[PDB]
Amino acid sequence: AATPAAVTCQLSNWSEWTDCFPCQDKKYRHRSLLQPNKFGGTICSGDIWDQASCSSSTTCVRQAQCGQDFQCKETGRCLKRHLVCNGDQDCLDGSDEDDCEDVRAIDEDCSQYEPIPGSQKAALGYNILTQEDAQSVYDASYYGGQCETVYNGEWRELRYDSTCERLYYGDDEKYFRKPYNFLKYHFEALADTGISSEFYDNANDLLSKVKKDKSDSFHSQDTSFLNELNKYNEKKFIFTRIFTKVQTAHFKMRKDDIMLDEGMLQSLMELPDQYNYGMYAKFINDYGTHYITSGSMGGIYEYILVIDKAKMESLGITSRDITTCFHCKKFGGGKTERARKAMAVEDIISRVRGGSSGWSGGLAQNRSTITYRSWGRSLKYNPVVIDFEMQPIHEVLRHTSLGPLEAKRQNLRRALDQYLMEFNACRCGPCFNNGVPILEGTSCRCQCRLGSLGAACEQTQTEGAKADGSWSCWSSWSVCRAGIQERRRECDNPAPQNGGASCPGRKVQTQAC
Amino acid sequence: SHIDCRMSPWSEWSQCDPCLRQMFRSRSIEVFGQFNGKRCTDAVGDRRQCVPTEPCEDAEDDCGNDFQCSTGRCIKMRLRCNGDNDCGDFSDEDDCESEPRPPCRDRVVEESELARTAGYGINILGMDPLSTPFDNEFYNGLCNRDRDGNTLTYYRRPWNVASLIYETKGEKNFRTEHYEEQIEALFLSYSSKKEKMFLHVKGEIHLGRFVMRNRDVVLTTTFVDDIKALPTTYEKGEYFAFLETYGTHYSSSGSLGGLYELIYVLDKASMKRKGVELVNITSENLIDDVVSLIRGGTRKYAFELKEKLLRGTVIDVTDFVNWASSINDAPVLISQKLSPIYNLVPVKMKNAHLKKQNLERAIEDYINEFSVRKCHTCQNGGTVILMDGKCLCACPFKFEGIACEIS
Amino acid sequence: VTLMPIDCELSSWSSWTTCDPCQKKRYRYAYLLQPSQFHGEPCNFSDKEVEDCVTNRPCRSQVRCEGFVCAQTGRCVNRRLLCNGDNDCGDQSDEANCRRIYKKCQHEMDQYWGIGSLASGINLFTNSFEGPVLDHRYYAGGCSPHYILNTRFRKPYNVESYTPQTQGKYEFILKEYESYSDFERNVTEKMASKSGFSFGFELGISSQSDRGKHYIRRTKRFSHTKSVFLHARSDLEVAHYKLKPRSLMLHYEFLQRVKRLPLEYSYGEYRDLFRDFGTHYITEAVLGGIYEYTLVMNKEAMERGDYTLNNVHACAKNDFKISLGVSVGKCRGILNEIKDRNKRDTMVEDLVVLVRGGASEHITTLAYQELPTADLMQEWGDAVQYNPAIIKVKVEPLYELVTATDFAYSSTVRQNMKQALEEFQKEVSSCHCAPCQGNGVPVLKGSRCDCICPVGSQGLACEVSYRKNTPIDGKWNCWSNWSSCSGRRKTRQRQCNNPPPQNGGSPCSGPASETLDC
Ligand SMILES: *[C@@H]1O[C@H](CO)[C@@H](O[C@@H]2O[C@H](CO)[C@@H](O)[C@H](O)[C@@H]2NC(C)=O)[C@H](O)[C@H]1NC(C)=O
């Protein structure tokens, strides 16, 4: 297939300005992304979202969001008053700890233990369309005046006192303070390894030779026929997979009274109770489509090696020769042809998620007792989120201290339903040759595996290889004429190029009117 | 012939900008100077001193109850007396003489260099990173300590960087392909031998991602000042010079890391050819092509590995580890999420929205005005390339020349 | 299409329950009818719904505390536990405003390593820890000297013993098997015949006929099979833990969540309770670590080789001489030759390694494919002291913590928990899922089901493997409903994965049918 053409990124006209929000003095408007730039071509310089200063002509009547609870000046966080002067700055304002005459208002003597390292990523939102962290959803630094600690089972750390010759383990970091949002943070050292290795090698050879000769002479006649065929076939296949998954933590996020991040809190209160797609779209784009509520903290290594070699060689030759003598005359003719074809293809992917750039690179280069041990050591210090569960960004609202918010929650649900089918990677065009389409902001890429090059991964150093189809985007919803609505999608973006897998899911979708 | 580049007439002069004491002209680049014509190095815009026709509508504003520094930035009072330099030239701290209270109470915290550089400016034209427009030395009075992760040194995350997570990854990806054929057969006849080999190796290391704060973001004084010193009218050259010095985008998020890559390709063919018209030919050609690339890490290890990589020498993992460890000292922005630079133009500024719009339009014109689209076609369909101020194309085949005009 | 994503289904709502007199709320819930699987759509996280109420009736006040009330927590604590020098509240209320604090535990004392893990409840059906249910930092005095080596510990009030009953069992079994068999033949035929006549008579006549024939056949066949089984396991035990039988001090969080349980039965709330804290708590456990290594090698090579040859010759010459002379030499032959060779080499290897307890350095180096050095096994077992796994567990269901000492309507809550737990065991079973391919195991994971694909299998359903066929183990479908009372019975069709296909593996577990008194 020849290269597809560039398209220019294209946006709809501006929606009208929202009325100037009384507490914010800001107008907002959105465009919608009518086309990303796809296979190169002019990117939009226009953003999808825009905001402008504007005096509202009307006061922030709603500013009294909270009463008896202590509300910070900078930010709508409303604290249960025992937290005021509790010794911990429970909002960025710090006003809850300002002018505190009563030092004995401090809740507890906890601060010697620092927060769990790496606990912050569990806070961050997640964007399923880009697999990227967002802004914080949870307040990763909030303790609610509590002093829940966590026994760090890896606390042992060798120390040598030269003056004593004592060789001992330094007690430091024996415990960590658990942030309030974490229901649990179970340190639990596990490892599981799985290897498979399969070798299939077959070689076949045939030869077949015929001679057919007749001589009849007195005048002399002599006829000879030869037919010979040789045909060689060899197929060699090696596949080996190594999955070594190491775990050091299981963490779970409280389902009750989730203390939203201050920035999230503000951004949320700013949303109108009326539906405005641009506002909620911006919210999702900032905090992500999804927030996380289950975790393991780990290192992972995966090694895959696939080698196919095939060689086929054939020779065919025939001759017929004939003779008439007594003057003498000689003739002959026939067919002969010769061919050899051979190919080998080999690839490896070695990837490590885990706790040090140096040793995780080393282990990505070189598997051994040395790289496994030193990478395992490094996982002591920089473990990584190895698996997580998540929920739509809107479901937090049900679980917040704030209450129903149900207008906002339904608005956010609608907005999400749209956004997931506006900024969807499917709308980037056909990435050939198992390239992965990616839509970042208003722009598309195809990420190409190493066999492929070019804007669409279209050109390949070899001429044809099994590559899979992928879905087109969903069509628009039908009109629902009955109480039911339809939507349609085809496995043609691209079609399976060389009889790769047809893409598995539904061809047809249907919906309540 | 070569085609000498061409430029528009000057625009009309603008009116005098009453606060800027200046008037301006625009000049489109009609033709880039294909085929090694005259380079169009001349400036796309021009400006002249003017005695202003009307009084300046001042660019200063009353920050009210906010502290107004020696520089134009205004900050909330609690940031005075932090010990931290929350403004320009400690003016928020020189405003303070007694009862200093660091938010890093009773402890010392390292300044992270990766945090300091986060938010790199980017120019879309070659995606060159410019310096961060963010003032990453502003903590807003917090002491959020994070480990370097590759080291136990704890560093204070600056206010602008919502996240800096050492989500370390390492990868090696390898592929080899080998193909070989031997073929034996007015009329034309030929017999041939053919062999194709491709080898592709790249490795990636990821040191961590920064995410810049979506909101409440505090910028360098020079950046905001350069938005103040901007014509309010659309003035192609003045916004182009702004985009050229700050870039049309910033990384709102990015991954730091290191990267290496090696490509090897060999193609070998042998042909014998005989033709008759109502000749005998023997030919051998070999093409062997190797490229080696490394990005990031300290020069010593980076280059030692890259040379040892380029040779068939087997790399001792110790040197690869020494490079991957030194990536902690000299990272490279291997990826970013790009937001238009005008999203940093702060709301609550004089003509803020208008300057936003004008930057949007200037970026439009800049993409367009330096578009290769207006170069002449390649004669053999090779890639047209826009050099600095001249345009050409290149082709890999035997068809060759400054426009591939011959073969 | 082979796969077809199946979306989550969950029932219509229950009725609203009546308004809870204490919670001044009412509740509604739904059952998960079908977990989402194979990238199906997941249902909204709203299997529970809640409403507020008018206080149609009052209810009992919260249970009287005869002790001191910890201000923030409201932990009822004994007045002897004030000015104690210990926080018994989870809060400073006990020690707040004390004129003199009498430090009892003046010495340097550590907590028992991992003791706070054991205070976590477990989901028995998942065997996975959940929220904290017991407060193992409550000491209630104590301060008896407990030592391990030179390190002295302060035991929690809840814990009866934590004692270093060290033990270790290693187990190594290596089985190598070889067979080869070789078969050859060589076989040859040659035939030669001559017949000629030559006579004088004048006249002369001569004739000669020549015949040659050769046949050759060879056959070769070779089979080589090489099989290795290597299973190694280390069971290390480092401490014995037992919880006290009685008067346990619950964790605040669990306490409160219990306090919020509705007095009327509505499954959704006890479900959420188990999903937060699980179903059971650990009364007695053996703490230590596991290492287990299991390698399987099968190397099978076969060669077949055949050779066939035929040769035929004929020449005849007849010559008659009387001057007159006439002769004909007539000769013909065919050669036939066939060679046929077929070779196959197959190697199938799989390894699984499994480690629990100890430091990540040792855990991962043991997770490499090589059997360890005795030194690294020593280092691992040293580090298991400080971060052990739980090898053996003896558990009691969490309702046994619900005690009148803490909760109004204790009996009612207890009974509700029994009922809810019984329903929960049904609703969380893996039996509900559609079967994996590829001998995959469906692990239900909340509202969606994940196939844990074995070593050598890949994809959402483990549908990708290079192995053509491999034994599929049988999997039960969900046990039937309770048979109507004339006696009580259930049945299991052993169907959900068919045991026989693809050289089907083990049949399912027993029982296929289960029967009871009503
Ligand atoms: C077609 O041209 C061939 C070379 O272009 C030629 O091959 C040459 O033959 C020479 C002997 O006659 C030999 O010494 C020399 O090395 C050479 N071989 C090669 C590979 O170039 C062919 O003979 C010629 N064909 C005919 C029919 O003359």
Ligand SMILES: *[C@@H]1O[C@H](CO)[C@@H](O[C@@H]2O[C@H](CO)[C@@H](O)[C@H](O)[C@H]2NC(C)=O)[C@H](O)[C@H]1NC(C)=O
């Ligand atoms: C991984 O890297 C190590 C270190 O460079 C390699 O160790 C060598 O191993 C070979 C045997 O495989 C020995 O002959 C060398 O003496 C070893 N060198 C050192 C410094 O110990 C190892 O070979 C590498 N393994 C792989 C698979 O690349």
Ligand SMILES: *[C@@H]1O[C@H](CO)[C@@H](O[C@@H]2O[C@H](CO)[C@@H](O)[C@H](O)[C@H]2NC(C)=O)[C@H](O)[C@H]1NC(C)=O
């Ligand atoms: C079939 O004939 C071949 C050829 O003679 C035999 O193989 C030879 O055996 C002799 C004696 O063992 C060796 O000295 C030769 O080197 C062998 N040659 C080859 C090519 O194998 C073979 O053993 C015979 N097989 C049977 C079943 O009779």
